[PDB]
Symmetry: D2
Subunit: 286 residues, 4 copies
């Protein structure tokens, strides 16, 4: 069991908004934290150097390409870990990248848990993330104190790859929930409804999620400070639509939502993905 | 002038299906005398005219524009039987064009027409948990307050005439596309090998699904699509929303995609709950043809 | 029975770009042309006055609301027509408006042919129109000399309402053909392809229709002179999607195309509907 | 320099399916010696063995993964190729795979032309392909006798990667043209229009491409013998949507078409991609 007694050193590959917040809760729980970032808590110069001085590695990188850049190659992290140790990938990446990393870990004798999370920076702050993990039950159990420190609930989704897939499911719901809301608000405004009336009325209905009601209140205030930036939301939508095409599942609502989030990312990659509400308001004003 | 049971005891319904009869029950408990007309035939009246002649206030609950026009207009319609100064409350989900036509027809009869569709289904109608979405003048909305208070938990004054109809269209789009989004996401998860019970239970625990749609997901886990809101009506409501969005020239690609999925849903089962798309997508992924 | 120049007088209800060009070809074929327009080459002050002095009436109005305005009432065209005459509606209207006019005609003893056309102002100019006609085969035969003068081919689509439905079919192919082309071009430009190269290359492939190749060449030139204005194309898509919803037929590609044509109309109602190509180039230029 | 039969007589194929074999027949007639490696197995046993025996390598594989399996590693085609030669990739793959192969080629001193084609098996039969090629103009000129034998027109689309991108553009037009047509036909049938009237009327309008009119005529008769199978069309749409998302370009019509082609693939992966017309007819008929 990867308690702070048995494995105190946790090294991060990637240390952005989400990862830095999980690190704080792991530091509080008794772990000693280190990190590597491509740009440059003690910092290590390469992924390999990071892995060579950690008991457990947590990966939090944006996409398949960043995962490959830090996992493999001359300075890659995987070859720096000891056999029997645990690699916990919390990144939102494709099923293909997940399978490649799992198999590379098996060759090196390292068990890779695909453990993406549901929740954004507010949930990371409060350690109320939901961990979505694929792997053998005994390997999930080894990581329990790490998952417990950063989250409020650990869902064992199935074997390797199951966490990645469950994350894609939840991302699609979140993305299309926002584009649905932005489009419906835009119709209402175009049809002459008072803006303050409309935003407040929608807070009162049962057909909007708590997450999206929070986004709607923020959008009433024009507040799109990044909790989950458009560039990352839109990437997650791209991953989901590629996976759904590989499985030959028709998903027209998700596909439409993806195109709306491409427009959102193009106009403002770094503000919150909910900025599409403002985008649609501007379309109907003009 | 307030439409309390004291001053306007007789509430006559045009249309009296699942939603309306539940509203009528609550208005009975609050002290009103309920009558109704239905095209198929609480005392019944044979025509909309006969209904309106013996009612103080008329409440309309019909499925679409065509049913509205058939019962409101003409020598035997409801408007011909109403008296100047009275109020007609339309709770139907109809187009902005139908709403404007009825408002102006009401004005020629001296009848104020409130467009007051509701948010909520049969469980909310049963518990008087409906949210009333009403367009009209502030003082006419005040006149109807005791009626709205008996059937719902909250009255949203959306603006002048037509505003309630428009707000209902907004909420319908959120509801319909929320379901198609959920059905498609579950379908991907199943196609990718996720265990069904795991997946359904996991989604009940996330913050990005509405309480309404979490209820639908739990029913779909059991294959239960007994109708609370049938596919044929949800799909009609999306048709109305997409027509209105086109008239306003607002691009709504997510809502448009959802509408087409609800056309498939209606074609395969018009009368089961609109959430049956979850089953439709499960069968596509299972290759259950 | 046949309406050869037997019935020399043809009166038009509506006399815009399309109608005026069929007028010239009918005048060339030896008919006597008269017209009414809501705005105001003999011009008649009311639809009634037009119908009273014409043998056959041809209707070309933009939408359902305009059709009812000029067809019905004591000043409408039907009130001026004599039992046994033919009304030929070439307007692009809903199946419901078509049925309403057919039944109203029956009450006056007037057969209404729903005969919308495939082709735009260039085809009206050359009499290359394809006539899409619903009605009884004998009534279609009566109107043959009229249809021959304005077009190259008469398709008997079926009974009343069939012409209107076939026009909806063809409108959807046109509209979504353009949005498909605009989006594909937009991808190519966003990925760095030279604009002049790309427009010229696409003229060389077999998967674009002759109509849309002509629009692509015009779009290379920024030429969106209004052969078919965005406001009318988008209305036609609205009618198609309403009808498809009433028939409960899932049409996701047509539904997506409609939303792109809503944006097109919002930005420029009066330019050619192909201006979406320019709209998408502007999105890519960002 | 120029890759005429005199200077470079041996053309080795990596992959040899419906289009590649038809390409090879035309290069045979032009005077080259054709050899081929296929994963199933004159055939050579490995891509390495194929490349060692050829003067020019032409690649025709279905996707990025097949391309990587056959180009890279000690048994791959690049390890058997000589500095100064040309690899011509006609495969419909991603911009990312194209860039990876170009850069790998550079390391071996091998110029990689990304030269996918517009046209299907009938056009490969008649050498009526349109070549869509990315690369330096001097390298395109080197390959001209090869392109001329298999096609009727070579479009130089720009530098490396430009051919792959132009192919994605054309794939989108083709895929969404078909889904548009299937949906419009479905509406017409649902609205009561006679089927033969409807198919015959659409053959006579100017808003359908010659390619899609050929598909429509075949669909009239229920004929979906594969010229371009649903599984490959749908893969091409997947690649286009991924690329459009990477470029952040909103393409809702193309995205909708892709979902319809996912259904088409699921129901029949191996029949012609135009079978969506039949799928939609069956939806409207309630089977």
């Amino acid at each position: 069991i990867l308690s702070p007694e048995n494995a105190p050193r946790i090294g991060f590959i990637g240390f952005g908004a989400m990862a830095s917040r999980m690190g704080d809760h792991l530091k509080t729980a008794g772990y000693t934290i280190s990190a590597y970032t491509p740009s440059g808590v003690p910092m290590l110069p390469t992924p390999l150097a990071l892995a060579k001085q950690a008991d457990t590695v947590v990966v939090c990188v944006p996409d398949d390409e960043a995962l490959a850049a830090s996992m493999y190659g001359e300075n890659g992290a995987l070859a720096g870990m000891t056999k029997g140790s645990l690699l916990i990938n919390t990144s939102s990446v494709s099923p293909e990248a997940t399978a490649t990393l799992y198999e590379a870990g098996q060759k090196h004798g390292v068990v890779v848990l695909d453990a993406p999370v549901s929740g954004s920076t507010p949930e990371a702050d409060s350690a109320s993330l939901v961990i979505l993990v694929g792997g053998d039950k005994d390997d999930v159990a080894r990581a329990a104190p790490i998952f417990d420190a950063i989250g409020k609930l650990t869902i064992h989704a199935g074997p390797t790859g199951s966490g990645a897939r469950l994350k894609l499911v939840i991302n699609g719901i979140m993305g299309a929930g926002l584009t649905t809301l932005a489009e419906s608000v835009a119709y209402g405004l175009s049809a002459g409804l008072d803006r303050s009336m409309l935003f407040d009325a929608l807070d009162q209905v049962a057909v909007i999620s708590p997450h999206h009601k929070r986004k709607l209140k923020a959008a009433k205030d024009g507040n799109f400070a990044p909790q989950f930036p458009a560039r990352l939301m839109q990437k997650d939508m791209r991953l989901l639509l590629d996976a759904a095409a590989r499985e030959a599942v028709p998903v027209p609502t998700l596909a439409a939502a993806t195109q709306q989030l491409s427009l959102t990312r193009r106009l403002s990659p770094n503000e919150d993905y909910s900025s599409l509400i403002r985008v649609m308001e501007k379309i109907v004003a003009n």
